[PDB]
Amino acid sequence: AAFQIANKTVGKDAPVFIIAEAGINHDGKLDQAFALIDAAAEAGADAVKFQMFQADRMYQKDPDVSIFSLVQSMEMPAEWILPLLDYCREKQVIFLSTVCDEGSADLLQSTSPSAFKIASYEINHLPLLKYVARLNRPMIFSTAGAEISDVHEAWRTIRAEGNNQIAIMHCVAKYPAPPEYSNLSVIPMLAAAFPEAVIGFSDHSEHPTEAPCAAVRLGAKLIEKHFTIDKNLPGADHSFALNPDELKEMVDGIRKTEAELKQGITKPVSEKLLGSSYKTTTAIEGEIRNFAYRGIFTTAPIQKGEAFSEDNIAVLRPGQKPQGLHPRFFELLTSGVRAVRDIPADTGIVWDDILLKD
Numbered sequence: 001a002a003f004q005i006a007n008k009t010v011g012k013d014a015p016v017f018i019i020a021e022a023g024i025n026h027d028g029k030l031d032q033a034f035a036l037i038d039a040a041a042e043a044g045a046d047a048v049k050f051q052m053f054q055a056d057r058m059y060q061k062d063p064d065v066s067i068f069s070l071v072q073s074m075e076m077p078a079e080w081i082l083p084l085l086d087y088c089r090e091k092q093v094i095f096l097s098t099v100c101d102e103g104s105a106d107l108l109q110s111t112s113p114s115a116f117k118i119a120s121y122e123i124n125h126l127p128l129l130k131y132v133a134r135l136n137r138p139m140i141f142s143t144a145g146a147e148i149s150d151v152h153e154a155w156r157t158i159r160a161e162g163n164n165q166i167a168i169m170h171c172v173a174k175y176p177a178p179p180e181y182s183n184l185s186v187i188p189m190l191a192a193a194f195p196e197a198v199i200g201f202s203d204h205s206e207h208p209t210e211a212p213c214a215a216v217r218l219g220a221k222l223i224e225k226h227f228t229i230d231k232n233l234p235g236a237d238h239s240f241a242l243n244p245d246e247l248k249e250m251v252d253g254i255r256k257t258e259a260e261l262k263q264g265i266t267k268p269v270s271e272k273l274l275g276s277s278y279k280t281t282t283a284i285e286g287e288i289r290n291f292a293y294r295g296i297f298t299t300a301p302i303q304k305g306e307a308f309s310e311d312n313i314a315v316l317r318p319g320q321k322p323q324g325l326h327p328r329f330f331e332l333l334t335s336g337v338r339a340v341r342d343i344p345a346d347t348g349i350v351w352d353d354i355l356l357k358d
């Protein structure tokens with residue numbers, strides 16, 4: 001299990017691939033975005049990751065579409081993007097971002113991305129996983145609150161499209177995540193369970209080295225950690241992210257641990273960090289797979305008799321609403337299936353909406 005992100009190997013015998021996660025910590029200032037890039041580079045990270053798309057588009061569908069409306073849906077100003085990419089290319093770091101639908105995917109695609117990153121709550125956005133898999137770039141997906149079957153289904157879905165360059169991140173959705181909640185024994189379990197996937201760890205814990213290094217010495221081949229330029233900035237994700245020094249410190253930790261392993265140096269991992277190998281949601285996450293993953297929702301009122309289509313249902317995050325049918329049924333419903341009763345707009349689809357009982 002190995003593949004290429006840009007000019008760099010990820011997986012068996014390759015160095016750990018380090019992603020510095022900048023998020024929105026540029027505070028809307030382009031020069032601060034360049035400074036985050038600098039910090040990542042000086043730290044010796046492989047990749048720097050920015051949020052491109054706004055969270056709203058994940059909970060509600062937003063209505064020949066104008067570029068001037070498109071840009072209102074993005075996190076950073078569109079005029080930043082080529083310059084950032086240029087500046088990454090010259091500081092020899094790999095720019096990465098996250099997609100959450102077909103449209104965000106297309107926007108990112110238009111910049112020739114090195115990999116597509118998928119967040120935990122889209123682990124079951126199967127139409128999205130299929131759509132991006134067909135672009136033939138590496139795919140990194142996160143697994144906060146997932147069980148083994150979700151990980152498997154996401155995996156199979158990408159593989160079925162002919163794309164076998166997959167990395168699976170273990171992750172805890174709490175931020176920050178107390179050490180006790182790491183459950184690092186999950187990393188070897190996933191690696192044996194998916195021996196053609198490359199397995200990483202997105203780290204949401206505060207400490208600069210204890211969980212990153214323990215993960216690496218349990219076999220993780222990518223590490224993701226948040227960083228900022230200054231921890232005291234009025235916290236976007238500032239307060240709990242690593243500052244530039246701590247980032248460099250983490251990297252040096254990881255790289256030393258790698259070379260120690262090359263020498264045969266053992267180093268056990270604490271009971272506290274190991275936790276349980278049963279891949280599942282934590283006590284501090286609490287069944288997000290039921291209330292936070294995507295489902296199928298009406299975007300308009302649907303009337304009895306009416307064909308389901310791309311135009312009246314969508315694969316969306318529930319927010320506060322009760323969950324819609326699993327996204328695995330989205331293709332089926334839009335292939336000419338019809339409502340058996342009126343469905344209000346903004347309501348998750350349910351079996352009684354599609355199954356005849358009269």
Ligand SMILES: [Zn+2]
Nearest residue numbers: 021202204226
């Ligand atoms: Zn994160």
